[PDB]
Each structure stands twice: as C-alpha cells, then as structure tokens.
Design a protein around this nucleic acid. Structure first.
Lengths: 262, 151, 205, 50
RNA sequence: CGCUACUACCGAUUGGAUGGUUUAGUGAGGCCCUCGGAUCGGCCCCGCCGGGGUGCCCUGGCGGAGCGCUGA
RNA sequence: UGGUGACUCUAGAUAACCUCGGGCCGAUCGCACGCCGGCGGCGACGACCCAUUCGAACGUCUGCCCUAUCAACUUUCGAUGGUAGUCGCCGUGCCUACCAUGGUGACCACGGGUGACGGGGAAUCAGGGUUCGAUUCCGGAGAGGGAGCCUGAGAAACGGCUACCACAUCCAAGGAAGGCAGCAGGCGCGCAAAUU
RNA sequence: AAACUGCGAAUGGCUCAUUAAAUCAGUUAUGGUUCCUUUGGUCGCUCGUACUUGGAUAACUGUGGUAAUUCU
C-alpha cells in the first residue's frame, strides 16, 4: 500500500474488544496515541459496547462532544482515542471513575475506582536517557515524557503519576518479590509476585511469576508491569484478583452460583 | 607489515595518529593506540585484534560492525576471497508424509577478520549477524574452532 | 532518473531475476553532484520525508582542521591533487569525500604566528611586511612573555608541513560529502597519512 | 482584428472591431508589454499610447 | 494387396495472419546540469502638490526618456 | 552524566563552519472577563526539535508446484569479494574506478513450463494421505501496454500529470478530450454468473 | 453563496495479469533508515513600526476570444 491505512476490518480487530461479526464490516480504527493499536480500548468501544451508555457511534460522538469524558484527567472528544492499560476514565456528569485494567481473560474490565484513586496512575518506564545538557528524561508505557526523574528510577520500574500535575510521586523498582501484572501474552491479566528473572543477553528476558494461589507462570520481560511493592498492589484490582481459574473451576463456580438462586 | 596496500590511506577512523609529541619523550613508536571493542554475548576479543596492525572496517572487533540477531555456526568450505570465506551449514529437513529427513545444506558467505589467522578448510566457525556488508555477506566470523583431526 | 533497487541484479547463483513490480519512488537515485571548484553554488534537494539535501555544485571555500594544533579555519580550496577512486575526478577537479585538495595556508599561518609568536612559512630574505611585526613581537609584560616562551617549547612543526607552509598551500582531505551536505569540510594531512599521500601524488604525476 | 482597449485610470473597457490593416500594422511584429503609439486608430486616438 | 474412415509424423508446398526475443541506427517525454533572459520589482536621474523637520526638492501618489547596481 | 550483551550510544568540552535552493527562537484566531500604563484566565491554530503511535522500507533463519527430451551456470552488458567514493532515507555492486578471481551446482544449480498471486484456509479422509485455495481476512501486484515524473509525510498514484504503443470520442479540419480489474449497466466471449 | 487558505484525495473498493527463495508464512534485526497525524516533553536556555511591517492575488465589477473543454 501507499501511505498509512485508515480502516480496521471488524474481524481483524483485536479479539479482546469482544466485537461481534454481524454488526458491520468495520471496527473503529483506533487513533494514533499513547497506546498501541492492539493494546488499547477505543473510547467508542468503552462508552458503547462496555458501558451501554450509547447505542450507536453517533451517540458516542454526542457524548464525547459534550466534553463529559476525561481520559487521564484531560477531556477527550476523539471517540476512537486509544485508552490503554492503567488509564483513568472520568465521567464527572455521572460521577464515575474507571481504570482500564486487564481481566484474567485478557480483556479490559469495567473496573470502577474511587475518585481519590482516580487522581493517579501507574506507569511502567520504557526508557531513561540523558538529553538537553545533562537533563535526565524518562519515557513510560503511557508515552508521557518526564524530565528530572529520581536518579534511582530505571527501565522496567513502575512510577506513580499524579494526573493533575503529571509528575512522579512514588516508584516501585523491578525486584524479585514485587507484585506485578502481565500486560501481554498467554498470561495476560494475571497478577502475582515476581519470583526470578532469567536474563538472555541479546534476546528476551523471561520473568517467572507466582499467583496468590500458588500458580507459577512465566512471560517475557516486556509483558511485566510492576503493580505494588511486595504483594500489596498500589491500585485497585478487579473482582477477580488476577487469579486465572481453570475451566473446571470456572464451571464449578458458575454451577455453585446458579444453584444458590431459586 | 604493509598495511597501506590500497590507493587510499588505511586507518581506524576513530584513532588520531597525528598528535604532536616531542622527540625526546619517545618510548617505542610515537603514538598509535589501536581501537578495538568487546562484542557482547560472551565472545572474547582475539589477541591479534588487540595487538594487530590490520585495517578492516568490517571486523567485528576493530571495525564498524555491530553484531545483533542470529548466532550461527558452519564449517569453512572455501577461502578464496579477500577477507571473506564460504561456510556450509548442513541440516536435516523433515518430510512429514514419509516421516523422514533429508540432508540439505546452505552456503553462506561470511566476512573473516584478519584477526583470525590460520583458519583452515573444514573447521567450525561461529558467525554473528550484522548489517549487510556486501551483496551476499551478512555474517561476521566471531569464533573459530579447529577441526577434530587438526593437530 | 536512475534507480537503486537490488532486484535488477543477478542472484548469488548467477541466475536471472524477474521483476515482479515496476520501479518504486523510494528506490530512486539522482544524478551525481560533480562538485567543481568555483564560486559557491548549491541547489537544495527535497528528499524522502520532506527533508532537505544540499547538492553543492560549486565550492571554492571549506572548513579545514589542523588536528595536531586543533586549529579549524575557513579556507579557500585551491585544487584537487589526488583521488583514490578515479584519476578522472582529479582531471575534472571534482570535490568528493576523501579526495586530496590544496587549501590556502594563510589562516593556519596567521593562527600559528599569533599563538606561538614564531614565524612560519616565511622566507629568511624578507624582513616581514608592514603592520605584522607587531603581532609577532608586540609589547608584552613579563607574564605574557613567559607564557609565549612556555608555548615555544611545543611549537616545533614537522618538516613536511613546514615546506607546505613555505609553498603557501597545505594538503588536506575532504571529510564531508559535498553532494549531500553542500560543504567541503576536512582536515589537513599530517604525519604518515601525509607521507602516504605525497608518495601517491608524486608516483602519479 | 478586434481590440479590447482598457483605460485603467477610470477602469473602463471597450471592444472595437478594427478591420483595416492600415490601422493595425502599427502593432504587428511587436511583442507583449511594449508601449506603442496608437495614433493610426483615428483622430481621437492621436496622442494615445497603448 | 484391395477398398472406407480416423490419427499423429516428415517436409523446399522458397505457403497466408498475429505473438514475442535481439545486434546496428534513430529516439518522444520527464528529471538533472550548463547556459539563456521575454518580463516583473526595489535604491540615485525630465516620480520633485504633500511632512511631528521653518524658503535643508528628501515622499509613504505618475513612462522619474538613466553600460547604474540589484532580486525574482 | 546515564545506558546496552555489544557504539564510533547518550550527555559533556574545545577549534571552527553554519548552505542566497537561509533552520528554530508565534507580527494568528475565539470566549470570559477582570485587577492599584502595567499584570492575567480558558482555549483554537502554527513552528522547529526529542520521544510515542500508526506505519513504511530494508535485512536474518527455515519452508514452495512440475520438468534432466534443461548439467553445468555467472564472469566487469557487476558476475563473487576488497578499497575509495557516488547516489540513496539509510546497510549494500545500488552504481563508478582500481584490485583480486571469484560465486552457484546431482543435497538438482542454470534453463523451461505452469488453465501458479502467497498464506490463513476448503473438499475428502480409519491411520496415512490426495486434490483445491480467482473469491469478502492478512501480505503482494496492477489499473489497456510500457516508460517518466509533479505535489506531498506518504504515490513512480492512474476516478493525478507527461510521452510513446494499441484502441477510441467530438470537430466548423484549426484543434480538443480519453482509461469501469469501482457501483449499476452494455457489447464481446463463452458451458458458465444479478438492478443503469 | 463565492473565492483564497488548510486538510484529505497514498484510505476504501476492484481484480489476479505479472510473479518459482520472487511474493508469502513463521522467526528475528534495524546498534543501518524515514515517519503526516495522535500523545507527552521542549519551545525569555541565543547578549545581538513592535499598541502590529510589505507587496500582491482571488472572489466581486467590467471587457473579451475559440466550433469545442472543469479553456482561459
């Protein structure tokens, strides 16, 4: 093709959007932005498919153009704006705050947070570099650049950003024994304590993680997002606490819940 | 020896050899430090690279080549090119219908830095991937292991 | 309007290759900037991404550095004397990277005389031109005079450079690419590199 | 040959049909943007240059 | 062998119609280069009525008939 | 200063250059209104630069149908490598000049054929396989055939331009205008496929 | 309304002619590159008429040419 593509076929859309197949030919192509195309949830999918606040894309536009939707503390009127991991969505008209947080199935849950929690977000620092006559700079997964970070902050650490001012207020190092979520791969959405990091120079480091129920998995280092110091998260977690039940336990839990009614 | 064999002057681009030094303060030659780097992945810089005089811009150790990508091995098959050898990689390809294998081989042209003196035909070479160095060359010899029968 | 694709070439086996598409714009090439020596003439080229290349068609002046003295000066380029790629480029006096040129020695001579208080390239029969014996000698106090005397201990210049300064033009290598940046910057030849290039020039002529 | 003649000082234009070669050879072989005395076009055109 | 039908093959019937490939020569058009310079515009001279600056003609409106520069 | 497995990285310092086809350092627009000539809130738009996103491009390793009534092929009409450059967004015989004589091949090179776009996939199928995949998703290619460009971040674009080749429209004969392998629809082709 | 300016028109749709390590697939790399837009940062970091500078050109008015055009 010549130049960039502007459309997204509904069936080539990320499967975690949980789009059906008969609504249309196209899926809302996420706009360029802080998060990657396949690692984001567009505002239209959140406000229409997840929250059911709108029935069509026209109503999503009508909501967004009234400036009711804030993403990370800023009003966004782009209905395909890419909202991704850790992003805080505030709807002040209805007085509700959400944080885009993965499910254990790898999907962005509708996770409501308190207005006090909506003041900050965790960000995994993607790189640290010196520029502009010795000024240290830090780049996060959110793609926000921060000048003058703490000298102890390194790549793969997690910082806490106050959304009102956008400066670092705390940080967790990437250490063994720290709680972390998985943001990609087969184990996407799982939460556990980092056990050990096997280093492969010139290749991908593998991080082993142990669930709160004792289940051990492993991912690439690029898929690890440190959540809290020790085993205590710095953010609220969804109803499932990052523990991925097998299909047998899911079936048993569903049957127990169904048999408890009636 | 005779490093200057080409029409243009041969030197390491990062080494300045024209510094002013008084005559009476000479210990050995005036000034010619040799540029070399240690490539990663646990490979050892050959002694000939550190104490050599050859000029090779495609050398992994004293040149302008960064090794990144695949680390492969092969047996030296031909050494009839200037600073380049042809190695042979043998492998077995699985045919599923017959549940069997077949011998296939690929010839790969790799750059041989003059730091590996006394490289024969038939000995193993560990090559690393770099940027395209010529039309067909994309790998640099990083290690040389002698053949079993070589005394 | 030439091309730069790799698929019009034979394969490693020597077999012929079939083009599966027509020429693409990103595989384009442009005519060479045969940068002559003459009054400055540069044509800006719009390149991929919207950036600019400076295609120098004529350059009479460059920026050349005396590395041992760390003396970088703007200097007229006089002639092209050696080309390792093609002798024809010398015959046409084409400025390319790594071509050996003659540059005016006056700026470096001026810096040397104003820094070391020592004559350079000056004939012994002459007794200096008016209004420059001052900068050579001047009226300095004890501190400034001892500073220049301390500098005088490291003011020795190699005989090859000295002879060049007598002739009034230095040998230099162009280190920038005039057809891409519009500039002929470089460094004065010194040491064994100067020896090699003098040997090559005298073997050629 | 028709003549679209303009007076910029008042901004007034007029097209006049001049089908006499005598009145037009004063303009022949003359290139654009050259002032020429349009005397031949008539007595009322005496002293005008176009 | 005689018939009848069908099918390939050989071949100068010096057979008729398109498809391509290529020595030699010519070569549109674009792009680059070296020139070119129709025109157009600025500063001093038959633009010289007018200004917070008075017999300081020096303008912010008209070929200012200029081998005078200058840019496009 | 920081970073990488690994820089000729990042940052710093010095000597200077700093493209007339000359780069950044705002002569911009709205709303709300103010405060003892000055100080201002909320935005819109624009410009470098650095990240980010969306990519593109170019490389790595492995994998493709039939054919030997195709066994040798390539070789400065660059073929394989070296040195220097040119050009290019950049690595590179991409091209050029010198130098070396290389490089591929029965483990099937090279040549030829394909009623051959590749893949995800489809039909059938005990196990194994056989055949198909123009076709809605991904990647490529093309816009009658070639070639060449302009603009632009991005096109060698064809619902852009320029030319030639084939076909073809209007004409007052001077000229002018073309590109349905877009959606309908028509002709032709055919065993074979829908509404201007 | 028009017109100037900006942006898009390089996406989409169609088709499978070309194409036999070519395309493509998985796997890596760009430490060998470009990147409109989005998002974040930087944007008194330069020691050298401003309470806003200059000339045009559309649209519009008016005069036209050609048989003929989204010509001018």
């Amino acid at each position: 093709a010549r130049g960039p593509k502007k459309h997204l076929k509904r069936v080539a859309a990320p499967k975690h959007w949980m789009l059906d197949k008969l609504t249309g030919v196209f899926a809302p192509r996420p706009s360029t932005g802080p998060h990657k195309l396949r690692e984001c949830l567009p505002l239209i999918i959140f406000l229409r498919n997840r929250l059911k606040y709108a029935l069509t894309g026209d109503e999503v536009k009508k909501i967004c153009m009234q400036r009711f939707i804030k993403i990370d503390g800023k009003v966004r009127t782009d209905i395909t704006y890419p909202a991704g991991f850790m992003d805080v969505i505030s709807i002040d008209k209805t007085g509700e705050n959400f944080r885009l947080i993965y499910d254990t199935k790898g999907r962005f849950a509708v996770h409501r947070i308190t207005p006090e929690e909506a003041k900050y977000k965790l960000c995994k620092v993607r790189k640290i570099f010196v520029g502009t006559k010795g000024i240290p700079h830090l780049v996060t997964h959110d793609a926000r650049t921060i000048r003058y970070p703490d000298p102890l902050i390194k790549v793969n650490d997690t910082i806490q950003i106050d959304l009102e001012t956008g400066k670092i207020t705390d940080f967790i190092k990437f250490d063994t024994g720290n709680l972390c979520m998985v943001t990609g791969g087969a184990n996407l959405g799982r939460i556990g304590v980092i056990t050990n990091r096997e280093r492969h120079p010139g290749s991908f480091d593998v991080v082993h993680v142990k669930d709160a129920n004792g289940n051990s998995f492993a991912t690439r280092l690029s898929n690890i997002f440190v959540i809290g110091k020790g085993n205590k998260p710095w953010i609220s977690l969804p109803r499932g606490k990052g523990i991925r039940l097998t299909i047998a336990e899911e079936r048993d839990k569903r049957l127990a819940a169904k048999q408890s009614s009636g | 020896a005779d490093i200057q064999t080409e029409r243009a002057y041969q030197k390491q681009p990062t080494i300045f050899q024209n510094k002013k030094r008084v005559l009476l303060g000479e210990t050995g030659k005036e000034k010619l430090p040799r540029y070399y780097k240690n490539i990663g992945l646990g490979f050892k810089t050959p002694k000939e690279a550190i104490e050599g005089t050859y000029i090779d811009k495609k050398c992994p150790f004293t040149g302008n080549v960064s090794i990144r990508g695949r680390i492969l091995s092969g047996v030296v098959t031909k050494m009839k090119m200037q600073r380049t050898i042809v190695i042979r990689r043998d492998y077995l390809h699985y045919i599923r219908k017959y549940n069997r294998f077949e011998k296939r081989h690929k010839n790969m042209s790799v750059h041989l830095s003059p730091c590996f003196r006394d490289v024969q035909i038939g000995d193993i070479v560990t090559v690393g991937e770099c940027r395209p160095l010529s039309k067909t060359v994309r790998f640099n010899v990083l290690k040389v292991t002698k053949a079993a029968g070589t005394k | 309007g030439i091309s730069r694709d790799n698929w019009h070439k034979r394969r490693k086996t020597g077999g012929k290759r079939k083009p599966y598409h027509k020429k693409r714009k990103y595989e384009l090439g442009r005519p060479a900037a045969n940068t002559k020596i003459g009054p400055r003439r540069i044509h800006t080229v719009r390149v991929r991404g919207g950036n600019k290349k400076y295609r120098a068609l004529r350059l009479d002046v460059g920026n050349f550095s005396w590395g041992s003295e760390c003396c970088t000066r703007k200097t007229r380029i006089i002639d092209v004397v050696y080309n390792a790629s093609n002798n024809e480029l010398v015959r046409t006096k084409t400025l390319v990277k790594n071509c050996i040129v003659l540059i005016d020695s006056t700026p470096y001579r001026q810096w040397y005389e104003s820094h070391y208080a020592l004559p350079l390239g000056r004939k012994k029969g002459a007794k200096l031109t008016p209004e420059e014996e001052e900068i050579l000698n001047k009226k300095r106090s004890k501190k400034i005079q001892k500073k220049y005397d301390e500098r005088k201990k490291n003011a020795k210049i190699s005989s090859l450079l000295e002879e060049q300064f007598q002739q009034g033009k230095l040998l230099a290598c162009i280190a920038s690419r005039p057809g891409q940046c519009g500039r002929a910057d470089g460094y004065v030849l010194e040491g064994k590199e100067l020896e090699f290039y003098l040997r090559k020039i005298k073997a050629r002529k | 040959m028709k003549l679209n003649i303009s007076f910029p000082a008042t901004g007034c234009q007029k097209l006049i049909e001049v089908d006499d070669e005598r009145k037009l050879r004063t303009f022949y072989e003359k290139r654009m943007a050259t002032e020429v005395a349009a005397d031949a076009l008539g007595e009322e055109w005496k002293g005008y240059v176009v």
